[PDB]
Amino acid sequence: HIWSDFTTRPSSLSIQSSKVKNYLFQKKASLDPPSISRRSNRIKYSPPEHIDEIFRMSYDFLEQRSSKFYELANKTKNPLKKDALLIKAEINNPEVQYNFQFNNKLNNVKDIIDYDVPVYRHLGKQHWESYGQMLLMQRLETLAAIPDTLPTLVPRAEVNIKFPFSTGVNKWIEPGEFLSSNVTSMRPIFKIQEYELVNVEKQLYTVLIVNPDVPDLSNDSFKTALCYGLVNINLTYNDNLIDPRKFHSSNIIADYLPPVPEKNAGKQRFVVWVFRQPLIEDKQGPNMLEIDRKELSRDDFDIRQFTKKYNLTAIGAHIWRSEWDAKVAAVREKYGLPPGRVFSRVRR
Amino acid sequence: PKSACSLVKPVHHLVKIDKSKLSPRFPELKYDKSDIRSPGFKPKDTHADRLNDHYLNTLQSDLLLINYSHNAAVVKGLKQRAWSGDSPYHLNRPPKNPRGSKAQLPDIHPIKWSNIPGLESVVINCFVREARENQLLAITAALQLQQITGCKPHPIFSKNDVPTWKLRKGHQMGAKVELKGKEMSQFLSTLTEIVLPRIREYKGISNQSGNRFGGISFGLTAEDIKFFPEIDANQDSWPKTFGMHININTSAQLDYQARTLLSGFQFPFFGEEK
Amino acid sequence: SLSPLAQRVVTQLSVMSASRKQPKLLKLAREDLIKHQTIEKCWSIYQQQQRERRNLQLELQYKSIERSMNLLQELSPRLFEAANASEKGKRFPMEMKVPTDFPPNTLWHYNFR
Amino acid sequence: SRTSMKDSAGRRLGPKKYEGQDVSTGEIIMRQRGTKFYPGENVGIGKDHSIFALEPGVVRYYLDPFHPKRKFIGVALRRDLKLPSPHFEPTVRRFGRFELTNKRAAYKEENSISR
Amino acid sequence: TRITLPRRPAKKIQLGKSRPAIYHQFNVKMELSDGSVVIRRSQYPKGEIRLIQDQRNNPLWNPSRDDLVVVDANSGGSLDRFNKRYSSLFSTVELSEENKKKTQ
Amino acid sequence: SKNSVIKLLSTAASGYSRYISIKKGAPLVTQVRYDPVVKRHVLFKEAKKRKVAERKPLDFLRTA
RNA sequence: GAAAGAAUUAAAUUAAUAUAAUGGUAUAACUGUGCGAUAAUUGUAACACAAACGAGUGAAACAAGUACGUAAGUAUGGCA
RNA sequence: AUAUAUUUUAGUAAUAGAUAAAAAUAUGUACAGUAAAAUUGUAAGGAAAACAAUAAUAACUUUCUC
Ligand SMILES: [Mg+2]
Ligand SMILES: [Mg+2]
Ligand SMILES: [Mg+2]
Ligand SMILES: [Mg+2]
Ligand SMILES: [Mg+2]
Numbered sequence A: 001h002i003w004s005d006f007t008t009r010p011s012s013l014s015i016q017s018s019k020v021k022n023y024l025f026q027k028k029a030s031l032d033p034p035s036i037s038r039r040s041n042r043i044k045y046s047p048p049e050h051i052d053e054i055f056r057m058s059y060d061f062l063e064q065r066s067s068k069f070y071e072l073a074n075k076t077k078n079p080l081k082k083d084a085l086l087i088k089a090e091i092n093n094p095e096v097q098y099n100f101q102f103n104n105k106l107n108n109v110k111d112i113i114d115y116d117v118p119v120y121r122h123l124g125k126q127h128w129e130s131y132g133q134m135l136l137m138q139r140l141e142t143l144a145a146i147p148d149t150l151p152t153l154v155p156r157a158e159v160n161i162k163f164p165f166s167t168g169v170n171k172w173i174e175p176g177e178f179l180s181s182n183v184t185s186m187r188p189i190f191k192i193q194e195y196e197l198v199n200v201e202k203q204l205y206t207v208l209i210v211n212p213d214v215p216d217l218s219n220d221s222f223k224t225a226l227c228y229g230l231v232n233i234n235l236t237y238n239d240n241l242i243d244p245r246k247f248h249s250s251n252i253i254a255d256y257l258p259p260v261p262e263k264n265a266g267k268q269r270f271v272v273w274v275f276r277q278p279l280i281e282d283k284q285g286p287n288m289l290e291i292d293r294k295e296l297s298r299d300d301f302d303i304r305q306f307t308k309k310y311n312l313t314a315i316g317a318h319i320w321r322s323e324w325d326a327k328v329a330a331v332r333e334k335y336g337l338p339p340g341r342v343f344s345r346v347r348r
Numbered sequence B: 001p002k003s004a005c006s007l008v009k010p011v012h013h014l015v016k017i018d019k020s021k022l023s024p025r026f027p028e029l030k031y032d033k034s035d036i037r038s039p040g041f042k043p044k045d046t047h048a049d050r051l052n053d054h055y056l057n058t059l060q061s062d063l064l065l066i067n068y069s070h071n072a073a074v075v076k077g078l079k080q081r082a083w084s085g086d087s088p089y090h091l092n093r094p095p096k097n098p099r100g101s102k103a104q105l106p107d108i109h110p111i112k113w114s115n116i117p118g119l120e121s122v123v124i125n126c127f128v129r130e131a132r133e134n135q136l137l138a139i140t141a142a143l144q145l146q147q148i149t150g151c152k153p154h155p156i157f158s159k160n161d162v163p164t165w166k167l168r169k170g171h172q173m174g175a176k177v178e179l180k181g182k183e184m185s186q187f188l189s190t191l192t193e194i195v196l197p198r199i200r201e202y203k204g205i206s207n208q209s210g211n212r213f214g215g216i217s218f219g220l221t222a223e224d225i226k227f228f229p230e231i232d233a234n235q236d237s238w239p240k241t242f243g244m245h246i247n248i249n250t251s252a253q254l255d256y257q258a259r260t261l262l263s264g265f266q267f268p269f270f271g272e273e274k
Numbered sequence C: 001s002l003s004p005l006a007q008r009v010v011t012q013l014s015v016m017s018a019s020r021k022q023p024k025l026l027k028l029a030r031e032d033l034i035k036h037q038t039i040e041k042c043w044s045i046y047q048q049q050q051r052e053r054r055n056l057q058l059e060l061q062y063k064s065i066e067r068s069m070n071l072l073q074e075l076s077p078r079l080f081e082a083a084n085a086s087e088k089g090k091r092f093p094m095e096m097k098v099p100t101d102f103p104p105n106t107l108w109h110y111n112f113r
Numbered sequence D: 001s002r003t004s005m006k007d008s009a010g011r012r013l014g015p016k017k018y019e020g021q022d023v024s025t026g027e028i029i030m031r032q033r034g035t036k037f038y039p040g041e042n043v044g045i046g047k048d049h050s051i052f053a054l055e056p057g058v059v060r061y062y063l064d065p066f067h068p069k070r071k072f073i074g075v076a077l078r079r080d081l082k083l084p085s086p087h088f089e090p091t092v093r094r095f096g097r098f099e100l101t102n103k104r105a106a107y108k109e110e111n112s113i114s115r
Numbered sequence E: 001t002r003i004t005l006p007r008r009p010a011k012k013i014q015l016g017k018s019r020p021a022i023y024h025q026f027n028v029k030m031e032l033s034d035g036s037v038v039i040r041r042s043q044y045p046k047g048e049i050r051l052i053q054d055q056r057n058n059p060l061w062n063p064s065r066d067d068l069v070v071v072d073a074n075s076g077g078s079l080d081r082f083n084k085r086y087s088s089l090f091s092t093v094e095l096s097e098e099n100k101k102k103t104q
Numbered sequence F: 001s002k003n004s005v006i007k008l009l010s011t012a013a014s015g016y017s018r019y020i021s022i023k024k025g026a027p028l029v030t031q032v033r034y035d036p037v038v039k040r041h042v043l044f045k046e047a048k049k050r051k052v053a054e055r056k057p058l059d060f061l062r063t064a
Numbered sequence G: 001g002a003a004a005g006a007a008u009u010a011a012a013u014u015a016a017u018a019u020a021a022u023g024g025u026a027u028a029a030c031u032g033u034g035c036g037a038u039a040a041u042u043g044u045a046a047c048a049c050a051a052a053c054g055a056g057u058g059a060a061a062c063a064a065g066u067a068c069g070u071a072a073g074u075a076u077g078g079c080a
Numbered sequence H: 001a002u003a004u005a006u007u008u009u010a011g012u013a014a015u016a017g018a019u020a021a022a023a024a025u026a027u028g029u030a031c032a033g034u035a036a037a038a039u040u041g042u043a044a045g046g047a048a049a050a051c052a053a054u055a056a057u058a059a060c061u062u063u064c065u066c
């Protein structure tokens, strides 16, 4: 009975509600489902017949298998194999499945879904790959964010963004969404959830928001501008919400300037890229890097050259879109930017 | 429409996109048909299956031993021939047809522990030619199939226009059904145990029957269909009954292996084999 | 206005149809859904183990066949050719019947021919 | 008898704009029955499968590895650009518009909005 | 000249709402000629049935057995009356009396 | 010959109309299209009264 | 060693295309399906092809409104 | 088990699959798939009715197992 043990197993591998635990592990069909709040509906409900003893036997079978997996995990040495065996051991646990399926996975509570645990990390990876990653890749491809900015993307982390300071309402921005100048006036906050084995004590991350659509009349084309940039940021599996609480001015290589499109200048795309820095060995402590701020262009940016020079690998991305409206002038005045240009209605 | 020009734009990533997951529409079709949350859910394993258990317990080993051939090798089938490059006109010339056939034929691998023959499906064909004048006989035939087998019948509709037979096109001439697993096991068991023994003069199945790559077909008449339990129980509701063809599709690489397998399932054979 | 044959076939196709015969959709609580998921995972794993045990037994049997064939080939070619002779026309005995779920009156027959 | 002297005048099909030639928006590059030449980039295709440039540039005939057994006609935004452009390289785009330096024009455009 | 019953407007069964077909069946017991019994699924409301002629009493399926009696339906037709009508002659005397004809 | 002409008139009392052909016995035509006078999509019905063919209503709530 | 996926390769446009013949079409333009029946709408149409004229053909872009789509977008009748 | 008042069931009707080359909606959009001949068989069935079978798995995943 290893699943009943919690000496070394994290406490999150159990259903924190006594009622639901007792109902799920009940001996006779005398209790009632806590999910059904109204008694009336509880009396109406009728569970499938002959379901608790088959459940007990299936539990015993799966638990024996998990015990064997734990036995082999306690002896494996390679961290990757250790993590894989832990996942295989706890994947089939009804309590883990309950917790993940029916509790929040984005604003997770450490005592229900702990991303320090391999099984929860793996289930979260699967959930993200099911819906979130596909939508992200579709939006990037269709809006042409990949080739314009960076050659490709192999998603390995979930990136969510929000604009809490601007207005006061709470909303995670859907990728490719159109946002008002008022909405995107102040600053974005990020949430970078990692699902792979990464050394939290050594790894550092950078985040760059760029706009590859700012018009350039010298050659009658577009160019890229570095809207926002942070370097030397450390995350954790359960504490990975980047905000002005979790970084200093030394991490800021380019303070945030808002989306300020020009009239008839087209729909501009603001793309967020998250990179992880190199991970040098034989050295203690995070490997911080200094950005050449007298070389950083900030208005004629070259992201491919930047990442090549600093040996960065992208692991996540996001995107939103902006276009002119009435509040752009107010934002320009508030940020001390020159009055906006006005371009023709026809593309000739 | 400005144009009719299909063209798929290339992508810049290796992530496979399935739009059925990005569309909020059809929430209940996102579940697999095996998922208890799917309205298409139907319990599969409700009871043990005598025929399958017998085949797994006894016939697999015997068939392996019987079909063993020492140091055997794959026999490649008739494939499309290639033009020798002795003439420039052969550069982009499509390949030639197989020597004796207009269609390519499969290769035959030696029987090994992983590819022992076994039953994969059964299909029953009921084409009531007299339904050309009466469309209700098709419904009766479908009910006959449903009662005999227990699966949902599927209608058969005329496709060709033959005047001599007075067969038009687009009319319902009968019904078909495909059986797998326990249901086909039951159908074959009841056939062998009840119906075939009750035929007047039954010697078995012809040894020169079946498509040359595994699969045995044989027919039954109306009087033969009358022997099934459901029809005999309520003769009153069966003034007329229809015959049907029965096609047993197996995993056999060749026909004689399938014949041995069916003989194991107790299907007699009488004719001289090819 | 319909014929009695029409009524008979309409009844037959009523037996066909699903109208006014299916029960309500099966809606299960979250806890029972999890229970069912565990049941199915257990059964799937179990059937996979059974299948693999059978496959391993057949692998071992085939290895035995080939080892025996090699030995017999090198020991006596006559017996090896007799063994390797094909059984293309082989059929199973007609009383090697599929097991039933309750035995017959005469369990075994002690006389033949 | 019944004399056979009925025929239709030759449809003036064929390439109407040759490789290396400079083209403007809307100009017809090819007239064809069906798609013997598919459209590449910076070019569109009409009802009768007429290829026409969507941007000013230079006409190039080429073949694309992504679409074997398919000829393509497209428009390069500069002479010095090979048209089967690298896949993982940012797309070349033409802004096209011009800034309204005139105060009155800028005012009108600023105050013009949709219905 | 053909007879068909009219088609009514088919009810639309939406995508995802299409359920499977589970016809009502009974766990019926089926007795063969011998004492053996097989459980099967049947749609007829008859939980029990026995067979008089079946696999277990057919020469083709039963070659090894020496003796095998055959039988048909009872209380139907004029079967067995060709014997019930003649009681004076009864079963080996006839076999002996059928020795030869002595005709040429 | 086999096809006749019809004047569809807009529902908004603006006087706008558009003309279309139709078969001799086709069901009465009505269609939503742009009405420049009111600057929106509005309904267009027949102007005159036409001899339309009679088609049986469908057996929908089961009869007899 | 074995299952279930994802699919890849060869071949195929000979079937099918509302209708002749030709060109095109599997990446489908062919076929099935859910919404829908909407773009088989409105005011300017550059520029080309073709061209004696008169006519004909493709169509970018601006503006008004619709239907479908998660989105990208598609639709100003029908593969030509 | 009888008697009545009220109510419920029975109008008994095909697709149960995003169906896919039997017949039916010839214009829009979104999702998805691949035909045809020929060969081998199969109650009536034959040249010709309807069903079934007919190219290759090296590489990549998840699972089970030695
Ligand atoms: Mg001509
Ligand atoms: Mg057409
Ligand atoms: Mg053609
Ligand atoms: Mg000219
Ligand atoms: Mg002119």
Ligand SMILES: [Mg+2]
Residues within 6 Å of the ligand: none
């Ligand atoms: Mg079309």
